[PDB]
Amino acid sequence: VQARQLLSGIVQQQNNLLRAIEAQQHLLQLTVWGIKQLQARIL
Amino acid sequence: QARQLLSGIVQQQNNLLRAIEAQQHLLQLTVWGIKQLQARIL
Amino acid sequence: TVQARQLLSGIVQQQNNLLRAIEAQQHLLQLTVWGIKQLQARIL
Amino acid sequence: EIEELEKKIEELLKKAEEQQKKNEEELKKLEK
Amino acid sequence: EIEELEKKIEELLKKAEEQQKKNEEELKKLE
Amino acid sequence: EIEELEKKIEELLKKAEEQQKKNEEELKKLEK
To answer: Do C39 and B42 count as a contact with CB atoms less than 8 A apart?
Structure first.
């Protein structure tokens, strides 16, 4: 219980990283379709 | 002490690490897909 | 606390490593975004 | 391969979301 | 869409950098 | 620059894997 404020910051930090990774997932998935659309345009 | 939260945090860290590693694999594939297109497109 | 200080230190350093990994991936993702846009300009 | 990776990623993030809730509930039981 | 995602990601990472400094500071006080 | 980023990312992930093992070891040690 001494490390209470630290643990709280750690847990909030893990949600910060999770939200960042999820937002990157959405962007990565846009780039996946962007590449697929270009591949169709060539082929 | 607070063992149960700490166990969950450590598990959570492995979860995040595993997700980032999987994203890296996918990013690597998109890097090559772009290079292949640049080779066909210039 | 006084026990788990070592684990707390490792967790905090672990979060910095994950954060730095995610930030590097963002720079790479940013590059792939522009690479796609440059190709779209040449094909679309 | 891409679709297998998308599936894997979303499963891992689902697992991380469940763990985030459990951690926040365990943190609350110590009074945040 | 791309631009709102890049903006969103960069704000989340800045928030994580702020929290990283706070956690590192509190790890010092605890130590 | 793409090469330098892939190298840096993999280096950080290997570093994070080492600390994950270290953290799991230390968690196990917290037992008796």
So the answer is: no
Q: What phi, psi does A26 have (nearest 5°)? A: -65, -40
Cβ atoms of D30 and A4 closer than 8 Å = yes
Q: Which of C8, C23, C33 sits opposite E13 (nearest CB)?
A: C23
Burial D1-32 (b: 16+ CB within 10 A, else e): ebeebbebbeebbebbeebbeebbebbeeeee
- CA distance readout (Å), D23 to A37, C8, C26, D29: 41, 15, 27, 10
Question: How many CB atoms sit inside 10 A of residue A18's CB?
Answer: 20
Query: At what resolution in Å was this solved?
Result: 1.6
Task: Name the H helices within chain B.
Answer: 3-41
Distance of residue D17 Cα from the nearest chain B Cα, in angstroms? 9
How many distinct structural domains can be found in chain C? 1
CA pair distance C33, D15, nearest whole angstrom: 28
Contact A4, C9 (CB under 8 A): no
Helix (H) or strand (E) holding C44, with range, is none
DSSP state of C3: S
Distance, CA of B24 to CA of B22 (rounded, Å): 5
Tokens 């450590």 belong to residue: B10
Whole-angstrom CA distances from E19 to A5, B11, B15, E5 are 12, 20, 20, 21
